[PDB]
């Protein structure tokens, strides 16, 4: 890879610079290079990896949604035909998005997940795996849409099982996992009641555990609890 000649520590340092510069494609490439050094990632390094690709795919997803909306309008009654260009460019963005998702899933499979033994790392990576299959599912339409959906569900479910056994209900990784699994249920799996039940139970169990936390941990947990609350307000 193009980062194979750069020191692991230099790649991590440059990932942090790229974040400050809001250069998230650079950040992702640096962190991909760091993963490919073959050593496990620390907590801070895992979060750098996640932030980088979240921002890259976030921009791709936003663009895909703009283009898909334009495409769908062009296919309504009375719409003037403007040729293949809208579909072509939507497919271009979609293919680039899928390539990023495939890259992340490839890193997780080679070999982040199999070497992740601690609950905090294993849950983190399995959540990521569910997230990037979910992003694939957002754009999927063909023979393997159901398998993509079930791959997201399976990854989220294994992460949930571990997190419930090994993590307190206020753990921010556990909370963000439950948040995203609930979004999966609502937006991908056509299961809004499951989405709502998971968000409410997650919120309530974290509420009851806040008294154990320091002020700093309390702030971390309540931040994600508010996102659960925001979604419940949207959904109910």
């Amino acid at each position: 890879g193009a980062m194979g000649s750069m020191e692991r520590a230099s790649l991590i340092q440059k990932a942090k610079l790229a974040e400050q510069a809001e250069r998230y494609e650079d950040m992702a490439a640096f962190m991909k290079g760091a993963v490919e050094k073959g050593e496990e990632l620390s907590c801070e390094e895992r979060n750098l990896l996640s932030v980088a690709y979240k921002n890259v795919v976030g921009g791709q997803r936003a663009a895909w949604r703009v283009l898909s909306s334009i495409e769908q309008k062009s296919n309504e009654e009375g719409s003037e035909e403007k040729g293949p260009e809208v579909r072509e460019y939507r497919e271009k963005v979609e293919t680039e998005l899928q390539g990023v998702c495939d890259t992340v899933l490839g890193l997780l499979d080679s070999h982040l997940i199999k070497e992740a033994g601690d609950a905090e790392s294993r849950v983190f990576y399995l959540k990521m795996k569910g997230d990037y299959y979910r992003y694939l599912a957002e754009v999927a339409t063909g023979d393997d849409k159901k398998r993509i959906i079930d791959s997201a569900r399976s990854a989220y479910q294994e992460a949930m099982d571990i997190s419930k056994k090994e993590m307190p209900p206020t753990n921010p990784i556990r909370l963000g996992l439950a948040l995203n699994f609930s979004v999966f249920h609502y937006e991908i799996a056509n299961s809004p009641e499951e989405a709502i039940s998971l968000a409410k139970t997650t919120f309530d169990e974290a509420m009851a555990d806040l008294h154990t936390l320091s002020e700093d941990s309390y702030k971390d947990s309540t931040l994600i609890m508010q996102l659960l609350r925001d979604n419940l307000t949207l959904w109910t």
């Binding site: 996640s50 932030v51 979240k54 997230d131 909370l175 963000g176 996992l177 948040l179 995203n180 609930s182 979004v183 609502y186 937006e187 994600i224 996102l227 925001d230 979604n231 949207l234 959904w235």
Partner: peptide, 5 residues
């Protein structure tokens, strides 16, 4: 819906 970072 809001998802995590």
């Amino acid at each position: 819906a809001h998802s995590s970072x």
